[PDB]
Write a protein that binds this ligand. Sequence first.
Ligand code: CLA
Ligand code: CLA
Ligand code: CLA
Ligand SMILES: CC1=C(/C=C/C(C)=C/C=C/C(C)=C/C=C/C=C(C)/C=C/C=C(C)/C=C/C2=C(C)CCCC2(C)C)C(C)(C)CCC1
Ligand SMILES: CC1=C(/C=C/C(C)=C/C=C/C(C)=C\C=C\C=C(C)\C=C\C=C(C)\C=C\C2=C(C)CCCC2(C)C)C(C)(C)CCC1
Ligand SMILES: CC1=C(C/C=C(\C)CCC[C@H](C)CCC[C@H](C)CCCC(C)C)C(=O)c2ccccc2C1=O
Ligand code: SF4
Ligand code: SF4
Lengths: 37, 131, 30, 62, 739, 139, 161, 80
Amino acid sequence: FSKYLSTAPVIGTLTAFFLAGLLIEINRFNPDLLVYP
Amino acid sequence: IGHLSTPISNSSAVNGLLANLPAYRKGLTPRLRGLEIGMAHGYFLTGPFVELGPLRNTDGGILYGSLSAVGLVVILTACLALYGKANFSGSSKSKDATLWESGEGWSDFVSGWLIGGAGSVGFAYLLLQYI
Amino acid sequence: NLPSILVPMVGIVLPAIVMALLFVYIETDE
Amino acid sequence: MVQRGSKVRILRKESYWYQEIGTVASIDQSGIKYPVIVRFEKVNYSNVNSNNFSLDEVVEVE
Amino acid sequence: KIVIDKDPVSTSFDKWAVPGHFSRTLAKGPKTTTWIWNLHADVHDFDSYTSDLEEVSRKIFSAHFGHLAVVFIWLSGAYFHGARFSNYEAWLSNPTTIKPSAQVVWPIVGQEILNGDVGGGFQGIQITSGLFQMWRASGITTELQLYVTAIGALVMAALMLFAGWFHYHKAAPKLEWFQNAESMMNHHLGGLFGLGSLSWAGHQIHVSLPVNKLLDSGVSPQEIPLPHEFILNKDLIAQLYPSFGQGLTPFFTLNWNEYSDFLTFKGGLNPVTGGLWLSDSAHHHLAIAVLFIVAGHMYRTNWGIGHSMKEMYDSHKGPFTGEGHKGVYEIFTNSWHAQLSLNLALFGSLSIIVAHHMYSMPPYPYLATDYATSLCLFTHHVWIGGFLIVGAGAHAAIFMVRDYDPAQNYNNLVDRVLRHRDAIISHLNWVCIFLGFHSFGLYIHNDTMRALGRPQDMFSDAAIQLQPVFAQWVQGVNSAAAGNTAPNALANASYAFGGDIVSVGGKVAMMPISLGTADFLVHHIHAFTIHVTVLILLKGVLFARNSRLIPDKANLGFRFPCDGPGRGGTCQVSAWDHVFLGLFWMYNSLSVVLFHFSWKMQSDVWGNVTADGAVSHITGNNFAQGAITINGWLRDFLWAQASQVIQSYGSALSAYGLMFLGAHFIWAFSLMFLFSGRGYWQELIESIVWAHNKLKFAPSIQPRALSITQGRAVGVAHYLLGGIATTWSFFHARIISVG
Amino acid sequence: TLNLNAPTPIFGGSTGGLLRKAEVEEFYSITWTGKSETVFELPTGGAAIMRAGENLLRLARKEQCIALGAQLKDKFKITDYKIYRVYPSGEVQFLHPKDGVFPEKVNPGRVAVGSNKRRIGQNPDPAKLKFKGQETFDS
Amino acid sequence: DVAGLIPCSQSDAFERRLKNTTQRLENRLKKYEPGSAPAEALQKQIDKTQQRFDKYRNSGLLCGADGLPHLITDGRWSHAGEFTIPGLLFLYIAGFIGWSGRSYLQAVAASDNSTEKEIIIDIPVALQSVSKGFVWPLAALQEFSSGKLTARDEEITISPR
Amino acid sequence: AHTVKIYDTCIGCTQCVRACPTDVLEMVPWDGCRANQIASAPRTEDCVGCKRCESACPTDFLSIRVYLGAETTRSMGLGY
Ligand code: CLA
Ligand code: CLA
Ligand code: CLA
Ligand SMILES: CC1=C(/C=C/C(C)=C/C=C/C(C)=C/C=C/C=C(C)/C=C/C=C(C)/C=C/C2=C(C)CCCC2(C)C)C(C)(C)CCC1
Ligand SMILES: CC1=C(/C=C/C(C)=C/C=C/C(C)=C\C=C\C=C(C)\C=C\C=C(C)\C=C\C2=C(C)CCCC2(C)C)C(C)(C)CCC1
Ligand SMILES: CC1=C(C/C=C(\C)CCC[C@H](C)CCC[C@H](C)CCCC(C)C)C(=O)c2ccccc2C1=O
Ligand code: SF4
Ligand code: SF4
């Protein structure tokens, strides 16, 4: 099953789930970031 | 066998109408069988023009609608002449030698369509505006 | 006045002539 | 002279593996034209890995 | 007889590591990138790689269990989001003013403006699924009952998921257990359809009818006793429809007339909810049960009596039709696709019948007044049903390519349709062009007559009338059956044919939908666009094996792009490509059906009723003189009613406006795949694999363009996804704002 | 020769077969011996029954005779099918096998028609053969 | 003032974008109970606009006639936070994704079956490549200077000319 | 009719010949070795231009090439 997790769709989804949820948490605590202050 | 055999195929109540229409009839000449086709087709072609036209409550709706009907016969006289020049280039022979297979009398068919067509258009004009 | 005569000529009559002229020209042969 | 198992590069311009590296499967020991059978790691559009070439279309990159 | 194999497939993760483990071709590894698309294409086509019909049928059996699991997962989330994230409790106190809402949206970047002012003390997305009116008809008054139904759906999802593992890996049936069609017909008719409508009638009598008569009297949803308290307290159930003090002794002594207060034939709409009477539906499903229970005692089994379906096809043959149905039973007990085609035909045809019978006879309380719900319930099941009809012509064509046999089909009814398929198609060819001219050209005439200043020369009600007299007569014989031909009915089958107006609150629940010249025009558009959809799909089914162009079309398969550029060009000859062409024509057929629906209801049916009895409709009866022209279909329907989907930015309707433009994008993105071809993009990629070879990192999986058959599929997917979601967004943001 | 007439199989059908092209120019006939009485699909629709025969079937195209001839060698293993093209209203008798041996098999006595003594990359430019009667692919 | 743009702290139109936004929500708060759950949902929504506008005044953005913040990309160092500072922030992350997958495919191709290792991701080899991807502006410079960043045009597959 | 040319890279695999739906191609004795076989196109007047032959050729870039030319009743694949 850990060999199955290295296959491209499931390893391509959970990092797409991770890279999304990074930006979801960043925009949650730090809202409305147009520019670098 | 090549052709399919349905129970309603090759029925004499249907095949008998074919052999006695003026397109397959044995005794008719091309001047006669074009006169009969034109007299039937010109008679009903003035039907749709006089009650479905751009002017229907007029003096006027029956005369102008019948003028459009002979307008189609003289158009279809040209198409019957155009089909004759194309499909009979020197009246190209074939195996059967009917009027429609090789032409050989085709100029009498197109003229007979014009007389019976424009006549029965005008004949049905007499039965609606008068009679 | 001349509009009433000419626009059914090149609208109806003249296209009927050139279509008749082109159709016999297509289906001729040597 | 190219032997079997040697790495070549293809000079045939119409080939899929033109200017690419392949290894020879075998050489036919007769006078048949295009005897050099090269096997490639990349597949072409017909999904085949082998082709026949002549000696003038292969080199000795080694 | 039951014969089961014990442990044919082990439960390991060894084949989870290998993608494409099931076929000889895909279990070699990817040399190109078409292997990725070839992998997902034929996974669930079990007939291709496994050539053992016993092995295919077990794969199909466990797959339906797994599909039954994901519907129960969807059913739990339909109930859990009804319990936790909904205003269902305040909605039962006021079903007219408070809009049905679920799906609270998280407080992030600005999509918490979608949580709109929907009613009471709640903020969420107004739902158009009808779940609030369905749970009110089921009797649910608290979210505790919605909670256990979400738990009860999850354990049913795990039970179906356990049954799918068990019936393939552990205890797999043989082939002869699947071919017992007469026992399977007996069991689904009696058990699945009979007892399913018997026991739901048991729910409707004991649970639905007690709490809904107390809702129509309107005490409170909290003052209403619990549904199990109508079973214990027999004096409480005797207070409303007092025939429960006599018990089941009227049932067993055949004195069924004593049940004439909760098993009625009232036949109409409730004046206080605008739905069907639940006493009618309780008497309905009981009669549906007894009709279905005895229908499961029809076919023969291992106890001698009954009909055998093989002997009903033998000796059903005439002099016109040769051998008749001789051989059809050997087709339907061996061809999984011929089963799938006919099952998809009447499951999709039924779904349009569901949609047509639910706006005219609204079954749920406060469904007809919710214009936001009844329109989307129509447009859902029409779209869902028409997709399955294309799958009927799809899988009928796969029957001809691989499951057809010349030896078994000799002079039967399959063969005799294959011998006059030019007579069927060319007569279908004529009737499409006949209906295309004589329905659509009557708009082109009406566009031209309206433009040229001649409104007396078009087809209208103040013009040359084309009246629907064959439908207005059926409007007369069905509206005059209360007391005449259905004598025990108090009112008609619906108020659509004729009758009074029913007004719940201030809005029309149902009113007579009058038909005219404009209704004659669209109904022949529908019959035209349906007949072309038959014309493409039947041409793919009949010419699936051969034609005059390609006589060995069955040797190339059901799914191939072409047979070359020769014979003039043979592109899209396959039976697959007729399904691909029929998907657009299904899109064209169904989208004008719902444009007919969404304008006929808003103009002639739906609207507000004043206290005096006068009706003021939504768009103001502009279907009669507007829908006769294409311009009026553009100006007064597509331009005027799309004013709420484009002015939706800055409100709770904004995501429909984002989906409106979001689907205009993907629809146009589809034409990149439809109008183009593969050999352009393969050489465009050849310069892009060059720049990845230039910096020395090109992938060993060689980048390939999509196939011709796949680029047709990628285009037809985004065309439908971009086309329907445009209509999804336009319909939703309109009727939420106006109804 | 063609052995016309020969018994047409017991079929009775097919709207989709042998229309007016056949009587004016160039229809085709395939003649085989079926060593059973089995049912077989046609290029037009599907059944007839194969006779013992001397079986004969008149088809519209040479394409349909090889597409039927591939079926008799695949399903029924009768490889003695003999396609033809008719007399006066047709063109050339005995289309296949032209040398008596199936074309996938080599036979001495045949000549290489349409051969090019080069590769396709050695084909000249179309600008080199501009305004000439020579063709870019012909040798 | 680089294109006729007053700053947003002095823009009278940018203040009126604040005034109608909180008026559309205080009118949306007028119908609810003061202690309810949609009451604190709109009060947290109003305070998100107050943290939106007071962030944009002090950031030194340029508001036009409509009253919206504009970005000035000619890059000046007084306006470097609009495009120049997030531009260098993008290119490192994008080059980290680029140099990882490029070095991953070079490590995979010199193996037995390189084609399966594009399906399955070798977690040792992938984590070896993200170590080589953090140093991409230093690693690509020595890869280019040593000459193994590019191939010659006689080693690449090339169409007939 | 269409023109079908056979180039000297043919390996006598017979795949093209066995792909043709109208029997346009056949194998003939080669004189370059008197051992192998090359494809030939003696009946190009029956070629419909389907290109099934080329799709069966194994050699990396075709040994048999079909260049679509003047169309005829036979080449257009008409039953009429
Ligand atoms: C949980 C324990 C378990 C394990 C270890 C296995 C293992 C196996 N199964 Mg079995 N099976 C199981 C449970 C299990 N199964 C269940 C619960 C069912 C009922 C669905 C089945 C029904 C079944 C059938 C019919 C077949 C197998 C087969 C197999 C073998 C290969 C399958 C494979 O590798 O693809 C792994 C597949 C996946 C990882 C994908 C799972 C797909 C799920 C079920 C549905 C996904 C839909 C989901 C909603 C996504 C939609 C999109 C989304 C964005 C919404 C493998 C030995 C095959 C076989 O033995 O061939 C010889 C075979 O034909 N299984
Ligand atoms: C493609 C997937 C799909 C989805 C997501 C939906 C979604 C929905 N359906 Mg629909 N449905 C579909 C396909 C789909 N439908 C098809 C193809 C049909 C035709 C069979 C139906 C028939 C249908 C009916 C009759 C009803 C719904 C209703 C609903 C809504 C409520 C959900 C619910 O649980 O009701 C649960 C379902 C019911 C309460 C009614 C079930 C009664 C039917 C007659 C049982 C038939 C079962 C039987 C096995 C199927 C016939 C087999 C036969 C051909 C041999 C929801 C919007 C309900 C609604 O409108 O809500 C307001 C509703 O009353 N659907
Ligand atoms: C709006 C664009 C459009 C139009 C007008 C058509 C039209 C047609 N399609 Mg096509 N189709 C389309 C888009 C369109 N399609 C697209 C996008 C696809 C890709 C999926 C297809 C795929 C498709 C398939 C698969 C099929 C069709 C078929 C048809 C024909 C159906 C029969 C009919 O109604 O004849 C009557 C013609 C009309 C109603 C067109 C309007 C004519 C007006 C009203 C009369 C003309 C006025 C005047 C006399 C014109 C000339 C004046 C001048 C000479 C002076 C019809 C010609 C079918 C067919 O051919 O069946 C026989 C068929 O099977 N189409
Ligand atoms: C319903 C029906 C039917 C019928 C229909 C039809 C077929 C009709 C038509 C009819 C027609 C369509 C008729 C025709 C008629 C004709 C006529 C009536 C004509 C006449 C004419 C005339 C008389 C003229 C003369 C003339 C001339 C020629 C020239 C000189 C002068 C004149 C003018 C004198 C049928 C049987 C199918 C079947 C069943 C159903
Ligand atoms: C500053 C600035 C600006 C400007 C800009 C410009 C003008 C630029 C240009 C640029 C350019 C003109 C460039 C060029 C380039 C070229 C080349 C030649 C390149 C190459 C590259 C490479 C080779 C890559 C590699 C890599 C890496 C590094 C990593 C990842 C992977 C890869 C492989 C991708 C602006 C105004 C906007 C704004 C402000 C600031
Ligand atoms: C655009 C187009 C292409 C090119 C399109 C292709 C090749 C699709 C490739 C795009 C996808 C999105 C590439 C996906 C690459 C990886 C899977 C991305 C993974 C990223 C992870 C983080 C998930 C065709 O091949 C084609 C073929 C036939 C008719 C029309 C067309 C056509 O229109
Ligand atoms: S041309 Fe192609 S298919 Fe024909 S023999 Fe030569 S290599 Fe084989
Ligand atoms: S193009 Fe088709 S018919 Fe012509 S030789 Fe090639 S395969 Fe045979």
